[PDB]
Amino acid sequence: MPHRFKVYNYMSPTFCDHCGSLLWGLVKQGLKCEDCGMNVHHKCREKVANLC
Ligand SMILES: CCCC(=O)O[C@@H]1[C@@H](C)[C@@]2(O)[C@@H](C=C(CO)C[C@]3(O)C(=O)C(C)=C[C@@H]23)[C@@H]2C(C)(C)[C@]12OC(=O)CCC
Ligand SMILES: CCCCCCC(=O)OC[C@H](COP(=O)(O)OCC[N+](C)(C)C)OC(=O)CCCCCC
Ligand SMILES: [Zn+2]
Ligand SMILES: [Zn+2]
Numbered sequence: 012m013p014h015r016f017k018v019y020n021y022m023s024p025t026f027c028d029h030c031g032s033l034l035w036g037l038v039k040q041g042l043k044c045e046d047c048g049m050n051v052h053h054k055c056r057e058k059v060a061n062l063c
Contacts, residue, residue, distance in 0.1 A: 012046075014063040016056050019043035029055040 018039050025034045027041060029051045034040035042051050047063050 012063045013061045014047065014049060014059065015045040016042035016049075016051065017045055018053075019050070021050075025050050027052045027055055029059045 019042060020038050021034060021040050027034055028049045042053060042056055051059055
């Protein structure tokens with residue numbers, strides 16, 4: 012099953028589970044999967060493994 016990512020607003024430092032770097036910024040720093048909670052950059056979304 013593919014992930015179901017949504018734009019998310021993080022309130023504590025959160026790293027991208029795909030590429031390892033911090034999700035930088037004040038708002039809308041990345042995407043969170045509705046089902047497994049994975050956090051990724053907007054631009055990392057297309058590159059993550061599709062097994063949720
Ligand atoms: C500017 C507001 C002051 C502040 O503390 O903002 C920090 C701010 C430094 C932050 O911790 C941020 C969360 C994320 C996600 O990875 C982005 C980062 O922004 C970022 O790029 C850096 C360097 C720290 C990160 C959350 C938010 C913007 C809510 C924040 O709040 C807290 O951590 C709560 C205290 C434990
Ligand atoms: C439903 C989305 C959350 C809406 C409320 C957001 C919120 O303010 O925080 C409650 C916490 C988790 O927030 P965070 O996930 O950014 O981490 C905790 C941050 N801090 C320690 C400073 C509180 O938020 C959650 O409950 C997590 C659920 C995530 C939705 C995905 C199905
Ligand atoms: Zn998922
Ligand atoms: Zn990333």
